[PDB]
Amino acid sequence: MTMYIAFILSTIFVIGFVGFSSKPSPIYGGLGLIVSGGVGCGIVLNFGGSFLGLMVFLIYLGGMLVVFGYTTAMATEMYPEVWVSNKTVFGAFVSGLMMEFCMVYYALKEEEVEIIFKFNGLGDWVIYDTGDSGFFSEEAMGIAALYSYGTWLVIVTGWSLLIGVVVIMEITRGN
Amino acid sequence: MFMINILSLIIPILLAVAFLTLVERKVLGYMQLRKGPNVVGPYGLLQPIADALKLFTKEPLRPATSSISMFIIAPILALSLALTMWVPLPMPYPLINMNLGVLFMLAMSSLAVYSILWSGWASNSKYALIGALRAVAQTISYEVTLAIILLSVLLMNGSYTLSTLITTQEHIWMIFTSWPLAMMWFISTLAETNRAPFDLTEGESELVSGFNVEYAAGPFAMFFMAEYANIIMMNAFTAILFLGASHDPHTPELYTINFVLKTLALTITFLWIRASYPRFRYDQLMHLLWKSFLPLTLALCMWHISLPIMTASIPPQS
Amino acid sequence: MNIMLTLLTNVTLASLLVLIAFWLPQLNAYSEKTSPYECGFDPMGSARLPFSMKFFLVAITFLLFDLEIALLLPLPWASQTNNLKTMLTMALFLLILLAASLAYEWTQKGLEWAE
Amino acid sequence: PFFDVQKRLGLDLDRWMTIQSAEQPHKIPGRCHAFEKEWIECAHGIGGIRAEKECKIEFDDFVECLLRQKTMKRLSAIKRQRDKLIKEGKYTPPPHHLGKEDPRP
Amino acid sequence: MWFEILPGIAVMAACLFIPGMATAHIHKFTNGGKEKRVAHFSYQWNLMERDRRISGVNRYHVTKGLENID
Amino acid sequence: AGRIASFLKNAWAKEPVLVASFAIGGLAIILPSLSPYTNYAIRINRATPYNYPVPLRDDGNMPDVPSHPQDPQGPSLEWLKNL
Amino acid sequence: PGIVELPTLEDLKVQEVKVSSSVLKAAAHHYGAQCDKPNKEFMLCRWEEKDPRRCLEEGKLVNQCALDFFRQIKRHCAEPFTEYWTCIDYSGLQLFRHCRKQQAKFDECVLDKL
Amino acid sequence: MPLVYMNIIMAFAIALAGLLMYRSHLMSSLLCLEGMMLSLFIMSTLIILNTHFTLANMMPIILLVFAACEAALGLSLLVMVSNTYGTDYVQNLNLLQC
Amino acid sequence: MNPIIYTTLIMTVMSGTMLVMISSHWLLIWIGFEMNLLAMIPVLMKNFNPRATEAATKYFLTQATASMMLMMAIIINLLYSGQWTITKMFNPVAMTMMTMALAMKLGLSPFHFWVPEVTQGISLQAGLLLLTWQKLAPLSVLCQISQSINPNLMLTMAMLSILIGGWGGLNQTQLRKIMAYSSIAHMGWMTAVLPYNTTMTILNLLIYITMTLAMFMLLIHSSATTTLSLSHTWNKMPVITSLMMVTLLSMGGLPPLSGFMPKWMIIQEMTKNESIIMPTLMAMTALLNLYFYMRLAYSSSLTMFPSTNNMKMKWQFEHTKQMKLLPTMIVLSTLVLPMTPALSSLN
Ligand SMILES: CCCCCCCCCCCCCCCCC[C@@H](O)O[C@H](CO[C@H](O)CCCCCCCCCCCCCCC)COP(=O)(O)OCC[N+](C)(C)C
Ligand SMILES: CCCCCCCCCCCCCCCCC[C@@H](O)O[C@H](CO[C@H](O)CCCCCCCCCCCCCCC)COP(=O)(O)OCC[N+](C)(C)C
Ligand SMILES: CCCCCCCC/C=C\CCCCCCCC(=O)O[C@H](COC(=O)CCCCCCC/C=C/CCCCCCCC)COP(=O)(O)OCCN
Secondary structure: OOOOOHHHHHHHHHHHHHHHHOOHOOOOOOOHHHHHHHHHHHHHHHHHOOHHHHHEEEEEEEEHHHHHHHHHHHHOOOOOOOOOHHHHHHHHHHHHHHHHHHHHHHHHOOOOOOOOOOOOOOOOOHHHOOOOOOOOOOOHHHHHHHOOHHHHHHHHHHHHHHHHHHHHHHHHOOO | OHHHHHHHHHHHHHHHHHHHHHHHHHHHHOOOOOOOOOOOOHOOOOHHHHHHHHHOOOOOOOOOOOOOHHHHHHHHHHHHHHOOOOOOOOOOOHHHHHOOHHHHHHHHHHHHHHHHHHHHEEEEEEEHHHHHHHHHHHHHHHHHHHHHHHHHHHHHOOOOOHHHHHHHHOOOOOHHHHHHHHHHHHHHHHOOOOOOOOOOOOOOOHHHOOOOOOOOHHHHHHHHHHHHHHHHHHHHHHHHHHHOOOHHHHHHHHHHHHHHHHHHHHHHHHHHHHHHOOOOOOOHHHHHHHHHHHHHHHHHHHHHHHHHHHOOOOOOOO | OOOHHHHHHHHHHHHHHHHHHHHHOOOOOHHHHHOOOOOOOOOOOOOOOOOOOOOHHHHHHHHHHHHHHHHOOOOOHOOOOOOOOHHHHHHHHHHHHHHHHHOOOHHHHOOOOOO | OOOOOOHHHOOOOOHOOOOOOOHHHHHHHOOOOHHHHHHHHOOOOOOHHHHHHHHHHHHHHHHHHOOHHHHHHHHHHHHHHHHHOOOOOOOOOHHHHHHOOOOOO | XXXXHHHHHHHHHHHHHHHHHHHHHHHHHOOOOOOOOOOOOOHHHHHHHHHHHHHOOOOOOOOOOOHHOO | HHHHHHHHHHHHHHHHHHHHHHHHHHHHHHHHHOOOOOHHHHHHHOOOOOOOOOOOOOOOOOOOOOOOOOEEEEEEEHHHOOO | OOOOOOOOOOOOOOOOOOHHHHHHHHHHHHHHHOOOOHHHHHHHHHHHHHHHHHHHHHHHHHHHHHHHHHHHHHHHOOOHHHHHHHHHHOOOOOOOOOOOHHHHHHHHHHHHHH | HHHHHHHHHHHEEEEEEHHHOOOHHHHHHHHHHHHHHHHHHHHHHHHHHOOOOOHHHHHHHHHHHHHHHHHHHHHEEEEEEHHHHHOOOHHHHHOOOO | HHHHHHHHHHHHHHHHHHHHHHHOEHHHHHHHHHHHHHHHHHHHHOOHHHHHHHHHHHHHHHHHHHHHHHHHHHHHHHHHOOOOOOOOOHHHHHHHHHHHHHHHOOOOOOOOOHHHHHHHOOOOHHHHHHHHHHHHHHHHHHHHHHHHHHHHHHHHHHHHHHHHHHHHHHHEEEEEHHHHHHHOOOHHHHHHHOOOOOOHHHHHHHHHHHHHHHHHHHHHHHOOOEEEHHHHHHOHHHHHHHHHHHHHHHHHOOOOOOOOHHHHHHHHHHHHHOHHHHHHHHHHHHHHHHHHHHHHHHHHOOOOOOOOOOOHHOOOOOOOOOOOOOOHHHHHHHOOHHHHHHHHHHO
């Protein structure tokens, strides 16, 4: 009910997902994914996840910069495609938009089980906890627990990163 | 009343950028045995106004091969992000008080590169494309080292809150504890703002105008304002991070003055560096950042993780 | 709430500057003027042709090294735990592998650009 | 298929993270700590087949705490009746439900 | 000059003075003149909300002392 | 003895950056294990009262639990004042 | 599934403590020193019952003890305390370290009078 | 459920369909994979924040790390494919049949 | 590839599989799958060629999609119950996602299209690894969640896998594609009995792995990848061809050979659950696998195909590298039927 801000942010999230899922030129795909990452950062911020949303925004910005470089290197064409320069891309974009519209309408105006279960809406504010205590952020404490509780996770993650470096070097060798 | 504060932030920043252009021209003139602008107004004080009025009364042109939407969007993104970078800076109080201000500035800075990339790509010109690829290379060069340097420096602060840096430096400047990291951070900010000797993206001697070669008039002026505002913001952030000014809660104007002089000194230091050195090759920049800065940065990150534990000097506020 | 208003104000100011720049001055656009620029002459090929990237391997490594930052940024909060020996061991362990990954790519000629 | 090396060696490689009632940092509790505690202690040691039947009440309470579907249904019904009553003017909201309350610490 | 560079630097310094001073003055003007409260955590926000509730005028900065305990 | 000396001289002549990086990393690795203040850091972390100390129900068999904060029983932070 | 029982609005009434957060922070150390017993009893009730409806009388006793503490402070010296909590209230973080002279003066006042 | 949960789930479904339906460029499909990962991150973060499960606040970070590993793997394979054919089109990868 | 690097990659693949094996947390199982795929991709490309690159790309795309579906199912299960333990999934939709994900990882029909192409595009050692070691982790995960699977979907996928394996193997002249279709059919047989007895699945896994290891090692020893190339082995190594023929008969499920025992035990276990029609169809369809095994045996050992003149030079040289476990694998692939009651040790 209250300003439905997170609803608008999630709708823009879905819109960006449709934008890069209709698969125009990878430049515009990366632009759509950047928009989706930003609005998802905002969504996560609205529920108290400042660190996680900001971190995913930073990570996807770096990834999309690398993707832009690679698109200019190896994914170009003489006429890069936009959402209105091709019948298939435009049709996919319109179909995604109208599917999201139909889902939203059938969701808020009556109660139906789309795929998993049903829901009425009422905004996100209802499911909150109104807990009142603390000189810390529980998200920050849980994330910092990785270095005291999650030793196993740190070990497997570091091994996977080193192996990933070795793997990319093995793959890009050629011969 | 909050919009009044937003305006009182943004408008003086634009005026400061306008007069920073003149300060650059005069300083580089005097280091080159000349005077620089001294005719348009007394001591050239009216030169920025004439420049702005000329630029915004000149015809802007759309390239025939250009992609129009991204072409128009990129300068808007650049200027808006340059203005947005100032809101968490405590001078001594911030307009927006954030728990994580440093990482927010990191994310916004990372997003700012896409203005350069998208302008270069949407110009649909060879020189602009070369400039955009050089920007990709520059970000790949500096990003990781800059972030780890921020981590190592802020380990002694105790949090990512920008206003805590004043309390951390109540008795001594942080530089007296992390001056190697300070030097590497200074070079990283030189690379991050596309300033000489790392002004690779424009590449005027080599690429004529680089990424913004197609741009003319008002759109060009916004790119210029965004770059200069980013320079001032980065120098102010460096002043907060490494040169802590004493803050009196009952007299914040003293802190404001001290802050302004320090950031002006750092901006003049950039100007001096531009007047002093030749330009790097853009592969040499990445080799410098990945073979010299990155190893020292990793070692100093280890050292600054270990030091508070060894000396029982861990800061508060988990 | 305040941050959304600030972002809206900044974007609005930039868009208004674009509008002023594009509607105030006199415009005389013709084909020669709006043509692509290559310093005296018409381009031979298109600017959309594939542009080789000689630092392609460092670009992939940047992706993996950027996530090292995500694992290391909670370190200021991790220093406040009681079991400081475990946290210090795991923090030093993580950076050592990052240093070894850089050393592996350096010694195997992975940092040199393609010729 | 599942070699329980952790149980054989008493290692606790990942069991610290499996449930919401297990030793959070700074003793921060989960939002549904008590319901999950009750459901776990009901179903412990009796096997999965019996746990589904003789502990369905605790699991239903835990799921209600997790997703709060029935609470939202009750609130929606109450608000629909409230709107219906006001639209015909039979019911008037009290001053403390319209923003004119007397606040207390 | 070399001292003719100074007027531009002075103008730029005057421009840079304005944001922080204006922010401080606006904070004092809109927070009872006593340095706008900082709420980095939920306990500080709870203190602010209780202060707003017990003020009687829906303003947190209106402070009630020992004169409110009859 | 002399082989490592010549190797270190050559490294200092050609790659001072890597020499400094390895020295700093090694110091950061080894020094914390020899410091007497690491335990003080652990105790300082332990002495920070993030949450409320829940009182215990007295049953008459806790001689080492105070009945008031100013009672002599319980932990003391006198060591922290002089640190 | 059963009817939730709630206390009536009459049973929830108490003589409220209507001093701001700065006053509470300025008095907190002596308040916890003097009013320790009812506060600890209330917290023990709170973490043992796990139900706010079962510890209302303890909360009312907490309110009464806090009111008595503040009444004593008002009766013996309200001026040093007012200076101290005003100094505390100016700060946006309500930092103790910025007000040590006023805190001292309040401390000698309470130590000599009470 | 909140309607934001449905929005994130449909974002995942749309990205999955985009991956499953292929156009000429290999790069477009990698972006769809990254979008699925982003939707998974958002959904898991929302679930963890809503229930106040403190210890899984680190789980999405691990998700992001292995997402970066996946993206690096895909980019390396794209490099080799484009070096082989001069183009990242999927229709060139038809030397092997069933 | 540096031998040290290859050893590290093989150990990383094995450690990811073991991480899937020993984990009680769904995130750790996902991490094990991710690490396994990351270390597996280079191994497919050890001998560089466009076919190997294409096979690795197809494998990566398929496995990444399966991993995304896996994580999405885990997240749904967490949403409808704050549980991370792999005991039994609490949501039917999440369980369907989990099943589809694990079937795509295993290569069950109709997600089978990648298996023959990837197997053909890689070397025989990589094919051996892909068709033996890569099945352990998803099968272990499916064994742990067996009580939650929907029997209809699982049995439909198993029957489709058997039918499609037989039909696809009927049409192949390349040996690697024959082995891939055989693998698909054997996976279908294994997943048919999983909702009833996981011990039967484990026994079928062990016997299939033994036979596949023996067959791949025999194919490496006689360095052939086509039917006509294997037709020459009689003129150089008749013993290898005879052992190949016996192993092929064992793979067809003929008594009294070893390959018959898993089918026999699966059929009897399914009949215990009043399932009669489907095991009958399963055996009648495995007749097709036996048919193309018999065709390979006809072309390889039971008749003598024409040879070339240069084989005389090969007659003078022995094998420089010898496989240590090949003799044991052949004996276990053929002569272990009398030791059937030992399967009780598997539960
Ligand atoms: C049997 C064969 C063993 C050797 C081969 C095994 C292969 C796997 C690699 C290592 C096995 C993992 C075992 C370690 C599990 C971590 C948990 C355990 O060790 O306890 C930790 C003890 O910490 C130790 O320091 C663990 C770190 C040691 C491992 C780091 C280096 C070894 C890794 C080598 C292999 C990794 C890849 C290759 C890297 C070179 C934490 O205990 P503590 O903090 O008190 O209390 C926690 C409870 N709290 C949170 C309530 C307070
Ligand atoms: C610094 C930040 C703050 C800035 C604040 C100012 C923002 C200004 C934004 C930009 C607008 C000003 C630009 C200059 C004035 C506008 C002139 C032009 O844009 O409007 C004309 C609009 O003309 C329209 O095409 C038709 C005019 C009639 C339109 C009818 C609309 C309804 C009118 C109804 C009449 C009755 C009164 C209704 C109003 C009350 C089209 O001009 P055009 O010639 O292409 O452009 C050449 C520009 N030159 C000549 C100045 C060089
Ligand atoms: C135990 C500490 C470990 C953790 C701390 C370290 C953290 C960060 C440091 C490691 C980062 C990775 C560095 C990887 C080194 C690569 C070496 C290399 O191959 O570079 C050679 C050059 O370097 C060499 O000379 C090879 C190794 C030489 C020795 C380097 C330092 C070894 C240790 C020296 C100090 C030991 C400890 C300090 C004690 C000081 C004595 C009191 C090639 O140079 P190019 O750039 O390609 O040349 C281009 C132009 N010609």
